[PDB]
Write a protein that binds this ligand. Structure first.
Ligand SMILES: C#CCN(C)Cc1nc([C@]2(O)CN[C@@H](c3nc(-c4ccccc4N)no3)C2)cs1
Length: 330
């Protein structure tokens, strides 16, 4: 089997991308944030504390003839930015772009933190990291991809995120028309439950390539590119007036600047992030200070190749027995 679904930025900054997902019978379509950095499929629901719902579409398991309570199962998750959600668990039929999994764990939120309440366009998350990170207790649950994997034509999914534009998640096949050149595959460590790999280095703008190993994760659920403070400083040093602001929470730069590109290495290949992809616009409406799309990972503990990086590439998440990641230019 295969599936293919369009993913759409939630706003003009590409802060996150949402993909329609059919849950239950008859289908209840929710727009979920596909997150290769986590492993829970959770949704706003009829059980979510009413004061914490602000315009999201909710899943109502009582209206699904295929929903079953996963008796005694609870979940609770906290994300890298401090946001969180928790609740109980149903199993139900979940379909993405024509690909159907029966008995998928659908984690129904009883509580969500403020950032989720404020994102009226995100109805939940669909985790695509390794199932070892799934938070359901006492019986850990598999991701949608893990459940679908054996049925797929090939045990892969691909992320083709757009720049200020829709993109595509495909399951079970590689769309050879969606990228230029060849896909360079690179080894993955699953030891932390992530799509964790080692970039071979970087370049800033037209500069030469700096060969250096950068261990990080391919995370569609993170907006920005988080890299070691050394690399990030070398990038922003090329932008007149750019500096790290403690009050703002990262590097800012004059909105009057044109940004240099940033290249990252995948083996001997190179992915070039255009400078415009690193511009996240005014820190507040009307400000002439703009927020940078490349930020330091120093306080995070791990480097994160988030959407800023991934949207410059066609990315293959190869879930074969030995997982790998593929990157192609596009
Ligand atoms: C600090 C530290 C150490 N370590 C935990 C960092 C990591 N964090 C992650 C993520 O939790 C999983 N991929 C990212 C994500 N973020 C959101 C999100 C979407 C909407 C609103 C709020 C959100 N947080 N959805 O997915 C964050 C992976 S590694």
């Amino acid at each position: 089997s295969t599936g293919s679904a369009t993913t759409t930025p939630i706003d003009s900054l590409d802060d996150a991308y949402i993909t329609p997902v059919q849950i239950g019978t008859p289908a209840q379509t929710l727009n979920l944030d596909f997150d290769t950095g986590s492993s829970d499929l959770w949704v706003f629901s009829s059980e979510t504390t009413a004061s914490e719902v602000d315009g999201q579409t909710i899943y109502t398991p009582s209206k699904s003839t295929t929903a079953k309570l996963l008796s005694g199962a609870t979940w609770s998750i906290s994300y890298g930015d401090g946001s969180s959600s928790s609740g109980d668990v149903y199993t139900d039929t979940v379909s993405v772009g024509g690909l159907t999994v029966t008995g998928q764990a659908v984690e129904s939120a009883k509580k969500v933190s403020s950032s989720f309440t404020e994102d009226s366009t995100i109805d939940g998350l669909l985790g695509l990291a390794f199932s070892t990170l799934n938070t359901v207790s006492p019986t850990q649950q598999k991701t949608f991809f893990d459940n679908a994997k054996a049925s797929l034509d090939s045990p892969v999914f691909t992320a083709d995120l757009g720049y200020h534009a829709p993109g595509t998640y495909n399951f079970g096949f590689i769309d050879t028309t969606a990228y230029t050149g060849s896909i360079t595959y690179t080894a993955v460590s699953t030891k932390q439950g992530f799509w964790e790999w080692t970039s071979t280095g970087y370049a800033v703008g037209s500069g030469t390539f700096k060969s250096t190993s950068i261990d990080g994760i391919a995370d569609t659920g993170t907006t920005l590119l988080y890299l070691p403070a050394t690399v990030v400083s070398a990038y922003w040093a090329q932008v007149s007036g750019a500096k790290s602001s403690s009050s703002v929470g990262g590097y800012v730069f004059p909105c009057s600047a044109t940004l240099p590109s940033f290249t990252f290495g995948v083996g001997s290949a190179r992915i070039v992030i255009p400078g415009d992809y690193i511009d996240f616009g005014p820190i507040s409406t009307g400000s002439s200070s703009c927020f940078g799309g490349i930020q330091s990972s120093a306080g995070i503990g791990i480097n994160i190749f988030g959407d800023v990086a991934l949207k410059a590439a066609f990315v293959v998440f190869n879930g074969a027995t030995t997982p790998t990641l593929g990157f192609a230019s596009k």
